[PDB]
Design a protein around this ligand. Structure first.
Ligand SMILES: [Cl-]
Ligand SMILES: [Cl-]
Ligand SMILES: [Cl-]
Ligand SMILES: [Cl-]
Ligand SMILES: [Cl-]
Ligand SMILES: [Cl-]
Lengths: 112, 112
């Protein structure tokens, strides 16, 4: 029911990359990173700030905002049970967590 | 580990009242309701809209926004375990859930 340690590390590295993109290029960097990661992992991705708004140039729809309310951290139990969908994983920016976080819907291959 | 049915009903009724206040008086009504419920139940309360912003006249601080990300629904298992604090409970407005929700930090007396 828990992500393997190496998978936690892998996803955490994406949050580091997300933060770096935000820091280096701001909204435009967050937007490009979001698109690239989403395509790579074939899954929903968002970079969100302290007020849970998109850090990218494209705002979140209300539907997307609804994904932000029942999230899991990398070391928490994971399952499709409660909501019949893959969990949304919340991963703080590692350098300055107060600036934002990476949210990624768990890729299907990684589910415990 | 689950709220008793009568307690689910009780808290759900607060969400109905919250929606009614929002519908009747807008931001001013949401603000007054939030204050009244918080005082009554001696606990943190927020009314938030589709973008997870306050429906009241006072905006959420970043600290308050952080309460919105790991919430529980009324019929989900409840515990202090995972985060060492009372759970934040998310309860949709019953008439028009797309317009907002009541968030209430679970009163201590109601914890399974
Ligand atoms: Cl934000
Ligand atoms: Cl947004
Ligand atoms: Cl985190
Ligand atoms: Cl809102
Ligand atoms: Cl707000
Ligand atoms: Cl609900």
């Amino acid at each position: 029911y828990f992500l393997a340690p190496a998978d936690r590390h892998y996803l955490a590295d994406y949050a580091r990359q997300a933060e770096d993109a935000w820091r280096r290029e701001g909204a435009a960097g967050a937007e490009r990173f979001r698109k690239e990661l989403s395509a790579k992992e074939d899954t929903w991705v968002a970079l969100v700030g302290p007020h849970l708004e998109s850090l990218g140039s494209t705002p979140l729809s209300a539907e997307e905002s609804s994904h932000l309310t029942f999230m899991r951290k990398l070391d928490w139990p994971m399952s499709r049970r409660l909501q019949d969908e893959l969990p949304y994983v919340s991963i703080e920016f590692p350098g300055h967590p107060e600036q934002g976080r990476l949210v990624i819907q768990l890729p299907e291959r990684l589910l415990p």
